[PDB]
């Protein structure tokens, strides 16, 4: 099992960003995809889930109306697009797989750091 | 729901049994999760199903408890275990917890 | 017990055997009765500690015997 | 398939007749006086029949006892315990029976245990005027007795509340039976629109009784417990003993079987006691799988069968049927399909229900009509138009009546 | 037999419409304000209709009255007495309502005595804006109005929980009605496989309504009580008043009766209001027996009728039936079996539904076609072949073309 | 009243006459309401004979009102 | 009307299989040990599967704690209350469990609130293994999940009572689905009875799935909530996607639509989701009326449709059908009744189930045979008798073989 | 929440649309258990006091468990 993320990106305040997560080593549509973030010096914070088989999405309350999760079965790649990014959103994002037979996150990618700043 | 790690920070020496407690406040089912996050990298599975050991982990780690408290226990402290450990759940959304670090 | 199933593809039909019978022919009637009384409207005056339920589940009984009395003569359905 | 051939009967005629005769203003006094000293009695009726009786609850003997120490004695002060909780408990049964009879309007089925609990039921069968073996049969299947009985409210009077509770009698017991299933069968030609189907129609329960066969068409009017079967003659037809001859052979002249045909074919499946019938047709996908391994067998176009050993799920097209797991032994008797022996061009379109002999005679008639008015047209070219009635010696020449001028 | 013609509709359309109307945020305030200091109200609605409102429970007043004892009175103490009595009963009703609603998706087919007591229903029928006859009719049949009414969970608000309790409105009463029963009717030929069958297919109920007869094909959708019948018009077909002529005679030209044809004969029976019909065919044995004298009558081949006077038990084949005991005057009527009037050979095989005119025209056209074929084929053998066209004046000699050499 | 039947051998059919009509052609939508309360869960910090049940059966009340509240707009079905 | 083409299978096979596996004399002790001091464990039986256990009610601990003061030689020394509270309130649930399982005799109707509570059901939903997608689909719809789940008593042992609970598992979500309704259609010939009627039988539910379409023909067993349907594939037929063409065109060659024919014309109606369709025939009165403006339109003889916009009630004959009040947009499509394109003489009268292509083929064969017989009958009068076989060289004069003397 | 109807007069038929799907294909067999006690049958000298309930409503539990034992052959 392997998950590959895109490289670091920099955007201006108020802009939108898109992070890709390509899966390999298993059946893409048989498991759900989750997004979690970790601010530097802070604990983990879950963002949302996106089922690839059906395309349904569930977003956390704190991020409602700002995040969009999309899927490409032919490329077996998920995308997380965050709009109206603020200064406090400077952190690293992970894409992980959840297992239906076990209630846990078994595979994690390398991680992508995104920096938001006017400079 | 609200999660709480009663230990916030703990320090000890080699070859010790350390106990970490995790508590909730609502219908938590009976499923927990204990992760280890090495600095600069991605966390890993250690305890799932709140009592079952993941394949490949040393057996010194154990997990038990039911109700409103769940305890993770390291039987013997090894030099290669000084890292951070976290607590997860699935009430309806998802929720990780403050978490503790095992400094030496 | 010995349950044996034989299939015939020629008519595409299956037959299970070995089941031991039990049937019904006729009914039997047996009247059942519950012996009861009326109720004395005279119960008591002010309450104190154990003289409220003496009428609480007593006016309900007085009602219940009534709506049983309503089912007077009309023939029930089948 | 054979629900229309049944009759109809009033299930509760006996009980309601008993109630009506009980409504003759003397039997209530007789039953009140007879049971005065005991709980079990047998009382005759005015018309000249005798029935059993019972007493299940006696509020009077308690309410009259407590009537004095609620007014004559202590008006309105704490009486005592067991006059508080017990009075709460006693009215519960009466309230619940009130609710049941008020919602169901005089007839309730199955008989809930509020009306009669296990103790009184077992007492009734112990005192039932019946043979021992029937008592042994009832003592192990009380819930079926509950599910196969009716109870009708009868009368209320000055201080007596009574009703009637019917009880089935298992007069016929311990005979061999069987169950017959069926599945659609059609031709396997690849050309759409040229398929004729055929399906047996007499599915259901068969049982033996006094040299004849009871036939139950509806599978939902017969219950199965362990390995024994319960039914009801009210939902039965009477057949001669040779019906099973249809099962061994279909063309036996002794008995005539039942079939049905149509030109519509769809893949389907049926679940037997110990296996699965699969009739897979068209371009769909039909497979039999196992939980440990996966798919185990893929069928072809046509009727087939699978035994329950080594198989758990049958995936027909889009659905997913679960096979039984009862332990038994199967046997796959081979042969040749029967539909292939029919001429597609003259096959009957469709019949709601018919017999193989009727189909055979219809085919014979269809062949005979064309055989008649096909060779009649074989004489075409052997007919010459009528000559005029003018008396002319018209001669047949060049296919017409011509004035003879060749030899004349 | 007439299931395939009924219309369909949503039986809860009015209830859901009213519930949706209640969700216009302009009525809940009014409905909780229009019942401030009473138990009954008549409230208009925004859409332009007015309905009755009836509240049966009151909690928050007692909840607050007890909250002070629960908390203000010596914090936590067991001093409070009789509060249990006032608490168990009050909470039990709400628990039962919630359970009954949750089990069956919130739309229970009947209305349990939990949702409303008999006194409340009597109050409602008292306050109905109807005539006196309907009120009297509903007064004595409170065990039937429940079985035809519906309960619909509607809306929950900051303190108000409200649901819709539908009730039936009777528009036609007291007109005469009559019930119908049918039975198989077949030939009694000894040789097996040489019989035909026709049965009437209009069994059910009939009631007058503004000069037009209704029809309820399913007798299980009409409860009865003593002598008055209860029925619903959701399953009714409007028919001309001439259908009862099919009652007395079938060959009338103004109305065409109904009939179903087949070729399967099985002995059976049908129970009616005051008697029993037995169709005893073939080798089966049929017997009418009385309670105290054993066998009383033996049937023969064909169909016949037995009244209830002195007869109580019927045995057909291997099944024992029962008969009603209603008091009434029966009347036997003689006649001629119509089945013998038809040609056995050319009888139509089978029809799910058919009329007398249909079979009459079918047999007419079949007979005419076969006769016109016969008249043409009766002259075959008296035709000679076409003569060759080779300019030859062939004469009819030896019934064939041949060079004339006898007279020329 | 009288209930009379006629049997005809020609069609082998039976007819019963004598009953009286009662049939439904309308509907009435009468609304019935039950009123509720806030029932603040917190109301005690100690034990008592009656108080014991009080808390259990009031928690039952809260669960009942909550579970019926969850049925927010489930479409009614016949 | 397509109920017979369905397959027949078993519903509780999986629960019975699990129960049978639970009788190996060691499994129950393993479960008791593995759930020693925790709830909701995952276990593996000897069959090699992985199932989920759950403890909902505990009585051993409470009884062991509270029986010593009552069972020991304390002379049953009453102490206080909260002993009656903690016991009398507890055993009622077990009493009701025995209640339901004795009345229903094993398998019980949709898990009752007493077998499983809402908190217990939700805590089980979290416990159950499956994708995160199927949480909001069946966590907001517990009231309808309860109606799609069985419950089977399994076994009683040393100190443990265990019963298996089925739970439906959802596999396909969010594909487009549509309902299909039909109505009678007939001509309007002046002579009563002479008309001809046809109908479509494909009414029911259609749902796209995996490139095919699942068709459910029992509309009474598919539930609707808001805009979501809910019913199992057990009652489904698998059809190719092209069948949808029958909706838009009635003579497409890709697929053949299903119809039936009859010669009986009646007036009726169907209530769609957003409107009412009415087939009005004969002299019966038809009228759609608003709740405020009274009558607004009278339908002519034939088929017609009304949208619910500004419509409250519909009346045909003596009945009265209400209409739904959902907010939506309809769209009438004009056209011509296809029944006008069929010849009355050669129209098929009775057909329980046939395709339009089958009807066309039967009609073609019918008139081809008629024309063949008439052309041959057109040759009548073009044949003479046969001359005597005595060798006479007669002549065909006046259609007879008379002696050659007219021109000889 | 976009429900529409199309009516075809050429067949006197009506077709709805816009409804979503939710199908059933599998079954989960999760067992449920209830702890129980053997229950001693010890008798008390006298239950005429407020312990009358304890003496009566324990025989009910005994009969319930006996009845469950009776149908255990399912």
CSV table of C-alpha atoms in Angstrom, one decimal, chain E residues 209 212-215 236-240, chain G residues 266-267 284 316-319:
chain,number,residue,atom,x,y,z
E,209,UNK,CA,-76.4,4.2,-4.2
E,212,UNK,CA,-76.6,2.7,-9.1
E,213,UNK,CA,-75.3,-0.5,-7.6
E,214,UNK,CA,-71.8,-0.6,-6.0
E,215,UNK,CA,-69.6,-3.6,-6.0
E,236,UNK,CA,-66.1,0.0,-5.5
E,237,UNK,CA,-67.2,-0.1,-9.1
E,238,UNK,CA,-70.2,1.7,-10.3
E,239,UNK,CA,-72.6,-0.6,-12.2
E,240,UNK,CA,-76.0,-0.2,-13.7
G,266,UNK,CA,-65.2,0.2,-16.9
G,267,UNK,CA,-64.5,3.7,-15.6
G,284,UNK,CA,-71.0,7.4,-15.5
G,316,UNK,CA,-65.9,8.9,-10.6
G,317,UNK,CA,-69.4,7.5,-10.3
G,318,UNK,CA,-70.0,7.3,-6.5
G,319,UNK,CA,-66.4,7.1,-5.2
